[PDB]
Design a protein around this motif. Structure first.
Motif, short mmCIF file in Angstrom:
data_model
loop_
_atom_site.label_atom_id
_atom_site.label_comp_id
_atom_site.label_asym_id
_atom_site.label_seq_id
_atom_site.Cartn_x
_atom_site.Cartn_y
_atom_site.Cartn_z
N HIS A 3 -15.05 -60.73 36.33
CA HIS A 3 -15.71 -60.08 37.46
C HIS A 3 -15.60 -60.94 38.71
O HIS A 3 -15.34 -62.14 38.65
CB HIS A 3 -17.19 -59.82 37.13
CG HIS A 3 -17.43 -58.49 36.51
ND1 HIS A 3 -16.66 -57.98 35.48
CD2 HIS A 3 -18.38 -57.55 36.75
CE1 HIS A 3 -17.11 -56.79 35.14
NE2 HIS A 3 -18.16 -56.51 35.89
N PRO A 4 -15.79 -60.31 39.88
CA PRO A 4 -15.72 -61.00 41.17
C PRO A 4 -16.88 -61.96 41.39
O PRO A 4 -17.80 -61.68 42.15
CB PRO A 4 -15.78 -59.85 42.19
CG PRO A 4 -16.49 -58.76 41.48
CD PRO A 4 -16.10 -58.88 40.03
N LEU A 7 -15.61 -64.69 44.54
CA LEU A 7 -15.65 -64.08 45.87
C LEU A 7 -17.07 -63.66 46.23
O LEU A 7 -17.36 -63.33 47.38
CB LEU A 7 -14.72 -62.86 45.91
CG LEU A 7 -14.99 -61.77 44.88
CD1 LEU A 7 -15.37 -60.47 45.57
CD2 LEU A 7 -13.77 -61.56 43.99
N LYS A 8 -17.95 -63.67 45.24
CA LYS A 8 -19.35 -63.30 45.45
C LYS A 8 -19.85 -63.81 46.79
O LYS A 8 -20.69 -63.18 47.44
CB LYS A 8 -20.22 -63.85 44.32
CG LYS A 8 -20.51 -65.34 44.45
CD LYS A 8 -21.80 -65.59 45.21
CE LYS A 8 -22.50 -66.85 44.71
NZ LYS A 8 -21.82 -68.08 45.20
N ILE A 12 -16.58 -61.70 49.23
CA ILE A 12 -17.09 -60.42 48.75
C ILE A 12 -16.76 -59.29 49.72
O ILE A 12 -16.67 -58.13 49.33
CB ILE A 12 -18.62 -60.47 48.54
CG1 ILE A 12 -19.10 -59.21 47.82
CG2 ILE A 12 -19.33 -60.63 49.88
CD1 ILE A 12 -20.52 -59.30 47.33
N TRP A 15 -14.23 -57.26 48.48
CA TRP A 15 -14.61 -56.56 47.26
C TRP A 15 -14.72 -55.06 47.50
O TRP A 15 -13.98 -54.26 46.91
CB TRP A 15 -15.93 -57.10 46.72
CG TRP A 15 -16.27 -56.60 45.35
CD1 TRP A 15 -15.39 -56.18 44.39
CD2 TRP A 15 -17.58 -56.46 44.79
NE1 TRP A 15 -16.08 -55.79 43.27
CE2 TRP A 15 -17.42 -55.96 43.48
CE3 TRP A 15 -18.87 -56.72 45.26
CZ2 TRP A 15 -18.50 -55.70 42.65
CZ3 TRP A 15 -19.94 -56.47 44.43
CH2 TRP A 15 -19.76 -55.96 43.13
N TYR A 16 -15.65 -54.67 48.37
CA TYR A 16 -15.86 -53.26 48.69
C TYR A 16 -14.55 -52.59 49.09
O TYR A 16 -14.17 -51.57 48.52
CB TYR A 16 -16.88 -53.12 49.82
CG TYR A 16 -17.86 -51.99 49.62
CD1 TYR A 16 -18.71 -51.98 48.52
CD2 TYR A 16 -17.94 -50.94 50.52
CE1 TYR A 16 -19.61 -50.95 48.33
CE2 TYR A 16 -18.83 -49.90 50.33
CZ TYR A 16 -19.67 -49.91 49.24
OH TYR A 16 -20.56 -48.88 49.05
N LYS A 18 -11.71 -53.30 48.37
CA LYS A 18 -10.84 -53.21 47.20
C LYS A 18 -9.38 -53.37 47.60
O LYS A 18 -8.52 -52.59 47.18
CB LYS A 18 -11.04 -51.87 46.49
CG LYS A 18 -10.73 -51.92 45.00
CD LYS A 18 -11.13 -50.62 44.31
CE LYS A 18 -12.64 -50.48 44.22
NZ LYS A 18 -13.05 -49.61 43.09
#
Length: 20
Positions: A3-4, A7-8, A12, A15-16, A18
């Motif tokens: 899981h990310p 990058l949290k 991040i 992330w959204y 993508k």
């Protein structure tokens, strides 16, 4: 799967989106 968590932080933002 991995899981990310790295990058949290600020990464991040991608992330959204993508994106690569």
């Amino acid at each position: 799967s991995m899981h990310p968590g790295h990058l949290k932080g600020r990464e991040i933002g991608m992330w959204y989106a993508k994106k690569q």
